[PDB]
Amino acid sequence: LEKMASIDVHLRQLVPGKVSEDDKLVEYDALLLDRFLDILQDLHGEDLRETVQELYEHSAEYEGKHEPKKLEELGSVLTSLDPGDSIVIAKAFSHMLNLANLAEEVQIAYRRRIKKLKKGDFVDESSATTESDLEETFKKLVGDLNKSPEEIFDALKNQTVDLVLTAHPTQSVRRSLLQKHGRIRDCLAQLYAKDITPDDKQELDEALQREIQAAFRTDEIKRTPPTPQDEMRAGMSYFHETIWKGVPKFLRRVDTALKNIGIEERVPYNAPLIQFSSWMGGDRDGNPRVTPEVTRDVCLLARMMAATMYFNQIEDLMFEMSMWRCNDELRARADEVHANSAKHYIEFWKSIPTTEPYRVILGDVRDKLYHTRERAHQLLSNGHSDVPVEATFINLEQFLEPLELCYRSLCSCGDRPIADGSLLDFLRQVSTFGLSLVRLDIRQESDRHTDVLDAITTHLDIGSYREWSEERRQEWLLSELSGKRPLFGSDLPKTEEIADVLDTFHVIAELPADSFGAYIISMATAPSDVLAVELLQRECRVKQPLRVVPLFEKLADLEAAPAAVARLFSVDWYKNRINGKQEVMIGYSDSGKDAGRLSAAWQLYKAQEELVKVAKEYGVKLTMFHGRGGTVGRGGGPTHLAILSQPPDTINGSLRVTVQGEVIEQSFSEEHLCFRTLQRFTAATLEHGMRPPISPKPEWRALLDEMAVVATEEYRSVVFQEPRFVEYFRLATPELEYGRMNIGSRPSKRKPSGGIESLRAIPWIFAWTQTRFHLPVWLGFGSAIRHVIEKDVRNLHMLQDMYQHWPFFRVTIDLIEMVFAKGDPGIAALYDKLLVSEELWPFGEKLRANFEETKKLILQTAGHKDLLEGDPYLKQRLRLRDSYITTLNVCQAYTLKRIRDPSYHVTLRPHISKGLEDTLILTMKGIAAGLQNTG
Amino acid sequence: KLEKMASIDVHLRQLVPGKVSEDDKLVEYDALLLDRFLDILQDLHGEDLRETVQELYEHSAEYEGKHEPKKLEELGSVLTSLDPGDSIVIAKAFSHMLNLANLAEEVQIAYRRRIKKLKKGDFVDESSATTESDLEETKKLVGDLNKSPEEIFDALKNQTVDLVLTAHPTQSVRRSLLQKHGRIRDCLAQLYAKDITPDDKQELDEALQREIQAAFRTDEIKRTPPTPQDEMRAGMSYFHETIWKGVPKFLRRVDTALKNIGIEERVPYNAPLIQFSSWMGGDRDGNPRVTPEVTRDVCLLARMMAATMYFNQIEDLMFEMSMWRCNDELRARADEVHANSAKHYIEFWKSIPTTEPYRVILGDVRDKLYHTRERAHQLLSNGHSDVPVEATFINLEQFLEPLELCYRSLCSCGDRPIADGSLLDFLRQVSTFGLSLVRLDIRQESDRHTDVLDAITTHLDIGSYREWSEERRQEWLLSELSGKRPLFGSDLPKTEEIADVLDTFHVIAELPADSFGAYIISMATAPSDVLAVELLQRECRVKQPLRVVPLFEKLADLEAAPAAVARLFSVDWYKNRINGKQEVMIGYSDSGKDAGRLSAAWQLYKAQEELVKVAKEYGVKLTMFHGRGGTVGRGGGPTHLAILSQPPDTINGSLRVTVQGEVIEQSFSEEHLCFRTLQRFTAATLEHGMRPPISPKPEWRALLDEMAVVATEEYRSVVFQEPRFVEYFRLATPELEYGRMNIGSRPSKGGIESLRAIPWIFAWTQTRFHLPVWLGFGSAIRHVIEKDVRNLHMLQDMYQHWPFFRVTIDLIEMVFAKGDPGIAALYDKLLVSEELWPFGEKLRANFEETKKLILQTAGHKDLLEGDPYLKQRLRLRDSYITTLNVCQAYTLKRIRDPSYHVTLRPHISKELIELNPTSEYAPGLEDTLILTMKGIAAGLQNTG
Ligand SMILES: [Cl-]
Ligand SMILES: [Cl-]
């Protein structure tokens, strides 16, 4: 059985050298592949195994030389498969790619950081191999920038990093597949431990094989496109995985780094340096499956999960807390708490004596936690309770109070060191996660509020709020918000939508405030959009209303935004309600859909500038919320510089970022990866506050203004002006199939009869990411760089200066370069050859030419001769995914030809040992998991 | 001025000079912990207190080095001059330091590397963990003995090792202080990882100090002398600690070794290679706090704990079990289970779909486990439930069936590798721990059954069951078991004791059979003692009666025992009821109390031989139960040879041994220690079954018979014939205080005969004298050397080639290492009348004489010449124990004698004096005595 010998050779040929000396990646991939193929042979036979192996080898050869004959060989083998074999080949390559991801994670987590590889400037911050850890970030602040330790500590207390978890654009993988990937991960890790006994290594190998098989033999589809509750259950797995234990870990690391620059204090245990907000169950923009009851469900479920974890933590806390010396205050509370009726610790002690006061108060807290979970479960499954809300914790201060009393008492008696053990960790978990783990954001279009108000104004015989000018709207809204009479009653004609909006507000009002983050207005354009939501919030009896966050999507909206926000601050009611804090959302991906990526990038930098001017004029603490698609939305290293790149004083101690679904596994599945994520967000925010990026030279801004004009011209002329574009888009791309399939819970368009305009941004990016072409990400960059080079050769020297010294520009170009690394025009041409009308082929040929030109221009701007010349580790990792993703591409393209065209009969082969829709879904989820994030 | 660290480094390095390997980091560990502890002591009670404590430790270490009595005089001088507050803090301090020494010991043993080049090639290698045979090396069977692997596999399938957890003779330390000891051990371990970053090392250092202080600031007294339920709760900590996870780990390792000798199968998941029995809540011998309700309590509690652990484990199982292809039988069972109402996993899935059949059956099992815990908690807390018995698992096969269905189904579809993961671990845990984790044994005196039958015969006007000869008793008991009429009713004059015995039988009758192991008759002497218990079991309507196990204590009982068992097998009713299985219990410590240690050891070897003869004559599978005090009761390595030492065919695939309380932490607190415990028990059993120790040469037998006669004579002449022995014992030893304080129960059942064996051993272990273990050996070896110049060469032959004799001598040698006559003399000087002084003097001479004689027999010039690692660890504990001894002796003089005024010193710094307010003796003297007792106890661990 010497077949294992071949795959080592093809792997070593795919990535030639070693990117370090702990570079064990090719070994890891070879081992996983060998064990997996042995499993495939043992489950489906020697013939199936030989076919799959020949396919992988061919794919490796293609990713080597990019010879199209290799692709035709792949096609020949794949078409000759009846759907039965097609499912097994597609499934198999999916799992193989997943294993490659696992090895990637292990390599990254245990790679040794090389201190002699730092150059000393900001470029070091674009890779995990050279980024500044927390303590290096401190020394930089204290050395170069002359900031005192006191100032660093004070800045830290007041800083908040808020990570927002979003429902996966496709597969938010089963809560069980995290677990299996974990076991494979850990087995791989220990097999290479330089301290392993032979029998331990044997049992580890058997566990590895057993779990690879365990993953290959579970189905990946069926049932419902899981209900929002199910997808939310999946999203919360990472709290069990790493974050719950990981947060006190990281915060204690902050304590140590502080001591090493002379600060004796710890970060206060009630300071919110870390926060988690979620969209799962709250985003309704173009997603009707998210009902008011869905939101109530994910809220109560969240409070349940939190109560369980606090409950199980407090028992180890209770064993720890066996001291007897205590405060007079704590002694009082213990003798008081002793006056009551101890059922949840009979296995531990018959009862708790008053000679163990901490155990008394903590056992009471354990009881209240129990009653909290039971009440939440009752309301979720029934609608009423019987658990008195007074027998539970209903707000965070009731919970923090006894714990803080313990900490005070322990410190009084000279027992602070015990306090900084399990007790401090526990307080830090309470303050970070609260009673809900996450705080749900709500999102809805502005137009739906227009509808609700139009029915309100029609029912009151005032006219139609939709016909009114923006100023008439503003005036009416102001008068009502200033007044004291309610607005409407049960007597109100409600369409299903209008009832949906009002009912959403009612459920928000029926739940504790600590469950909710922000109310987000999609397609916001004018101050009346924010005022609308504020009034609807008030007249629906929301006691403590949510902060309203406008989301400026289109480009014109972005130009009009700073006037709009200034106008909002100049109105007394909004100024008095916000309390000196205002949050605005920008959608890098959305704006990109409107006007191409380059113009959306430069416009967002400028718009953030003007917003900060306004927020300083009127004295509010502005917080920019970064939607899906940005530079700060990438995985790992690059985030560190993306954050540092943002315009000065747009962060101001409060960073709110979306952790895209495609990146969350890579960023939180493993102890080390999670630590370094929390670390680089915390450290980068802190540095950017005291060391803002350079301000751009005027010639740079003038140049980018030109390039923005040309780029939007090209992008809009191709995507919107070309009359035969959308026909091509529906042929050369699986957009229609994605819309009809059970992949995402969302409809792809806002009006089924509309063009590219009504198509949502997420399907736009996905459709072209499946074909390894990525047109939405780079289109426009070509004609911009071309235009300025022809106007004068010396502008290329200016662009290269910009790439070398202006962080913003470097991170924009870098993202593009990375997306090109995941691109292959050859595969796009194969989709063309099978799926596109012959008279439409030159269209594709021309666009691919545009591709190659833009790539050449991007490489020249970054001063590179190869893509990702600066990040060879990332280059290696992606080149290794390429070999599986390509097979999933060819399979997808022929499956499309077969699905769309029942007139394409193929000479099948005999079925291969112990249906086209399922194969297509597999190739989609696979390529999706392989390409991860682009734009 | 913090160069006190140089002082403790120098004293430590003098205490243990060399290296016993090169991964020998023990003195490093001890210095590091001690330094952090002393700094904490200074920051809590002041610089002066810290300097006092450090000076005391240095003096103690210098003493354990050169044994100069001046050092003892210095320690005493400082200790008498402390007011009770400072005496409490000094005593507590040294207790905690000794504990830290034990933790460092455990880490060093767990990570010491076994040296393959150090094996000598014979059985002596089996007396230390550093050279013993692992599972696979016990390959030995295949080489030397030419046994086929198939025969080894069959032997292993049928082998059962039954470890019995017993209540601690003193402090089975709070489930809370064990935990802190765990955090300290782990912190120590990770500080020495060769890949740890500087920030990691800083945070680990602070975590260690934090937990040392946290342990120092917990009280070690107060509350109740814990109820038997509390002691049982504490005893069950080790299942959560290591054993629950440890059993599937060990069994899988067995699987690997079997693969490594060519066997393709695994050990069947339902074969009981490991079992755990318990006495906590069932031994009532001289312990009236153990009531019927106590037994009902610990039974129900155990079933609760088991249900909780299965419940939490089965959720990881449910996530794992996401397969879809399955057996036809399993698909059926899944569709069947789908017809019902999914509450215990709303956080995981809204409900479980039928395309995940395994998850369906497993979710049902999770439901049934939940209801089992709730019903047990209800019965314990009320007396009734409302949980239908049909919704819980009441016997183990109900539980096993659906899991086995999953395993079968998974194997059907070629998913055996998935089956051999979390599912196999779960099946193995089910089979090993069952629904109770442990099985409770019950124990009671024979005389207490005699009372019950005597009141019965008096109530029926037949005579007094007490007056009847052993054969008249036998006769009546036989006719009654043959009969069909019940024996008694509510109309029966019951003393309080008799009500206790009958009520215990009724409670046994009310509980499931999986809860109970064996009924053990203390002071068994004759078959009528067993027949009484069988008859009481039947007439109290115990549906499935317990197996009855006689415990033959005294020497004459041991000679008479095989006659009794032969007569018992020769009775038709008993022969058919036992079903070919008989378990007999020996108490190495009890027999030791009767006739000296040597005579009890040899007599126990011979009596086991004769019992094997009887069991073959009548075809019964005999099972010997080793009570406390044995060679097989030691910690770690030595156990391996002790088991191998047993007489041929006395084990026969069924080993039952007592895990003494003082040893349990050393054997089960840490992952590796647990693995090697289970491994040496399993491997020793398997090997001894197929490779019996050599049979003894006839001259060795005759020689040991002689020595036993002399030794018993000396021992009894001192302990029972000297009229002033009992007077001395109450002066030179804290026996009266041990009984009068709060530890244990009742020591007397009169003189030393009515004194229980455990307080007998304890009293003389506190004063580092150990008279019960060695008394008699001196005069025996002296007698045989004078009888003939050559007998010493024969004894040395025995020590080198007869495993039994080697392990007896070896245990003695270890006990002497924990001995020090100087300290005993100090106890004399402070506590014993002057006209009694020569008595102790003469006794001490025997000690020294016996020591020299043991040394010559073992071919040694120093104690423990063969086990320098153990010598090092003991040498190191002794430096704390000695200070605790002096403190104890002066505290005794102060307690017994209110006319002993001492020039006290000014109180040091901030109090512990006021945690015992209702004390009849001085403010801090009671607690100080208790502290020294618990301390010295934890320092000397096991002797005899
Ligand atoms: Cl109880
Ligand atoms: Cl639900």
Curated annotation (Swiss-Prot), chain B:
Active site: 168, 593
Cofactor descriptive note: Magnesium. Can also use manganese.
GO terms, molecular function: phosphoenolpyruvate carboxylase activity
Entry-linked SUPFAM superfamilies: Phosphoenolpyruvate/pyruvate domain
Subunit: Homotetramer.
Family per record: Belongs to the PEPCase type 1 family.
Protein name per Swiss-Prot or TrEMBL: Phosphoenolpyruvate carboxylase 1
Native source organism of the sequence: Arabidopsis thaliana (Mouse-ear cress)
